[PDB]
Structure formats: structure tokens, C-alpha cells
Design a protein around this ligand. Structure first.
Ligand SMILES: [Co+2]
Ligand SMILES: [Co+2]
Lengths: 128, 128
């Protein structure tokens, strides 16, 4: 329920529907609409947003958070984590990693994405 | 922090000094010693320990926890994360990862360990 969680979901709802309803934010984050209203005011005072609209500041952060999430899902998928486990692991770790780690994981994903033989060799290890 | 953070540090202190003083735990986790005393009583209720002595259940968990920490450090090191950032990243993510992710990270570490050309090739993508 951090500021980052809220901005992440808000950004996504705007990308999905064109707007972010309080009730949609509430559902997405499994919190009561009261909590949502509280966070909105803080987000507004810290100028992440102004229905509700993200400032360029909020947009940059939202875009980054969605990037981080997708990257980390891709990372765990590539290394062979059971698909069903991936979402909860990503949600758990995404806010705790330094940009340095995100970027190195980014490079690692790129490393596997550029020659399928590498993915096959990784798979071979798991077999042992 | 969590029960796991406590068990990790307690197991470490026993490995290092032969015993775990409340004051050493408090210092290790940067928490108030009053918090420790209360946390210790809970670990006792859940039979992770009984001075402070880990039960077989507590020793098994502690060994796993230390293993998890070390593996995750190796992982971030191998993919080239700045050394100074590694510890804080590991502390943040370690109790949020499923065993499946840990074990796949283990396989990934093994992948890089068994052929140095893989490390070299990864170092090259970083230069792009
Ligand atoms: Co996420
Ligand atoms: Co640790």
C-alpha cells in the first residue's frame, strides 16, 4: 500500500480505461475506498497528480514502475520460475531493488533474449 | 523486522560467537532491545528456540536463511551490481521470494559458474 503501489495501479488504469476511478483503484489494491481517498490527497500534495490526472512527474514514475514490474516478471519467467508464482514474487521484491539491480537484471534479460541457445543451456542446468 | 530476519541473525550470531545475546540481536537488526525480548518470547512459543538456544526447527530454518542470503549476494554480484548496493538489495528482497525463485536463481548462478565465457558475454551486453 505504498505510494509506489498506488501510482503503479493508477498509471495502469489510465492506460487501460483512459481514467482512474477511486473504486477501480480500490479494487486493484484490495483496500477500502477510504484508504484510496487518503492516499490521493497525499499524491496530490506531492504533485504526482491533480477525474484524477497524473502530472508529468506522476507519469514518469508510473511508466518506470510498470517497466520495473514487467522486467521482473520477464526475468523470473526466463529463469524458469513456475508462472503461478511470478506475480506475487515480483510484487514482493519490486519496491526493494536499487535501480542498479533493476538495470543489471535488464541486461541479464537482454543477454538471454539475444540467443535462444543461452536459454536452452540454462534449461539444461535445471535438469541436473 | 520479521521472524525470519530474527532467526537469520540469531543463527549467524551462534555460528560467529557461540551464543546469541539479546543485545547483539538488537544491534544486528538496529532495533530496541525491548522489541527483541518480546520477539524472543514469540520464537519460543513457535518452538524455533528455547541462554538462547535454537531448536532443530530453528537451526534448519536459520541454515536455510543464511544460504538464501549468500546465494542472493552471489547472484547480484555475478550480474554485476555495484558491491556497495548488494547487501541492502538482498536484505530487502530475500524474505519475499518463493523457494521456486530461490532455486531457479541457484540454477542461474550455477549456469554462470560453469563457463566463464557466459560471464564475459554478459559483461559485453552491459557495454552496449
Ligand atoms: Co508491480
Ligand atoms: Co539476509
Amino acid at each position: 500500500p505504498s505510494m509506489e503501489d498506488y501510482i503503479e495501479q493508477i498509471y495502469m488504469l489510465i492506460e487501460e480505461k483512459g481514467y482512474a476511478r477511486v473504486s477501480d483503484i480500490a479494487e486493484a489494491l484490495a483496500v477500502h475506498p477510504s484508504s484510496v481517498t487518503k492516499m490521493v490527497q497525499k499524491l496530490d500534495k506531492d504533485e504526482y497528480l491533480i477525474g484524477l490526472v497524473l502530472t508529468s512527474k506522476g507519469k514518469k514514475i508510473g511508466k518506470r514502475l510498470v517497466y520495473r514490474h514487467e522486467l521482473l516478471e520477464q526475468f523470473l519467467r526466463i529463469i524458469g520460475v513456475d508462472e503461478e508464482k511470478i506475480y506475487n514474487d515480483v510484487e514482493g521484491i519490486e519496491h526493494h531493488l536499487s535501480w542498479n539491480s533493476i538495470d543489471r537484471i535488464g541486461d541479464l534479460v537482454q543477454y538471454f533474449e539475444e540467443d535462444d541457445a543461452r536459454k536452452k543451456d540454462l534449461k539444461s542446468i535445471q535438469k541436473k
